[PDB]
Amino acid sequence: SRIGKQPVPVPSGVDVTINGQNLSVKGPKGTLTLDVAEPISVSRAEDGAIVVTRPDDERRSRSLHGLSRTLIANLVTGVTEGYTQKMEIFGVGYRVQLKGQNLEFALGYSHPVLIEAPEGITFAVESPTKFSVSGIDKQKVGQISAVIRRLRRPDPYKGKGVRYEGEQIRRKVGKT
Amino acid sequence: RVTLFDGKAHSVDSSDFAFQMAGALALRDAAAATKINLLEPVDDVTIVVPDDLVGTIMGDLSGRRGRVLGTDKHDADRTVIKAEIPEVELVRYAIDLRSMSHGAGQFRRSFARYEPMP
């Protein structure tokens, strides 16, 4: 609702094509495709924006409004600039290094662990303890970042493991 | 204090041993006629532990019923803790302390006095 009535500006280098319910956005970082729900209507505001409209005020349309608007906003800001989220690793002997596209982790297991790079996303290690994940799609970046995060179980005592950029984990003490 | 105020005896059947037994049984009955106070000893304990672990040891003594007497600066990094602990709580104090201290726990004990059980 409140989010829904806010039109989405279009940067200059962005090409926007509307085919019925379908929408496609092409920009410097690539192309992306989206589909909106039937009750929500999408229009090209000639002043260079996108307008989403719900004919009704009922629950379902009012809920889908802001959803569709935010989806479009993420859609355009993905191709105009992109998405990049950073990770750190804490502990002794915990390390990361890239094998081409793949990412390789030493997490105290008997075996080293490997992660493929799925389509449309890249890994860039900065230091053996700090790396980054970059892609154009926010959802896929978040998915792979969560998968990387779940690699080692939470450790409230020593704090070993993979953490997000500013994440503040809860910690207790094992006195004995 | 025992106050013998009355009694009975036999002209032929009175003996020193019999009166000893009678006095012992009377004392036993008087003890059973009231409550008996149990007094347990307490040993003063002086502990040298790092200042960063002061709270953990203080709380451990809090769960050990210890009465804190004072926290004296042993040096720039350790604080002398003076407290009197009942001897029952000190049976396994050393092992838990070396735990509560990465072994850094050093203490000395000495008998202080006897006190009734709380």
Swiss-Prot record, chain A:
Keywords: Ribonucleoprotein, Ribosomal protein, RNA-binding, rRNA-binding. Pfam families: Ribosomal_L6. The keyword Ribosomal protein applies. GO terms for biological process: cytoplasmic translation. Disulfide bonds: none annotated. Gene3D superfamilies: Ribosomal protein L6, alpha-beta domain. InterPro entries: Ribosomal_uL6-like, Ribosomal_uL6-like_a/b-dom_sf, Ribosomal_uL6_a/b-dom, Ribosomal_uL6_bac-type, Ribosomal_uL6_CS. One of its GO terms (molecular function) is rRNA binding. It comes from the Bacteria. GO terms for cellular component: cytosolic large ribosomal subunit. The keyword DNA damage does not apply. Part of the 50S ribosomal subunit. This protein binds to the 23S rRNA, and is important in its secondary structure. It is located near the subunit interface in the base of the L7/L12 stalk, and near the tRNA binding site of the peptidyltransferase center. Belongs to the universal ribosomal protein uL6 family. HAMAP family: Ribosomal_uL6_B. This is Large ribosomal subunit protein uL6. The lineage of its organism: Bacteria, Bacillati, Actinomycetota, Actinomycetes, Mycobacteriales.
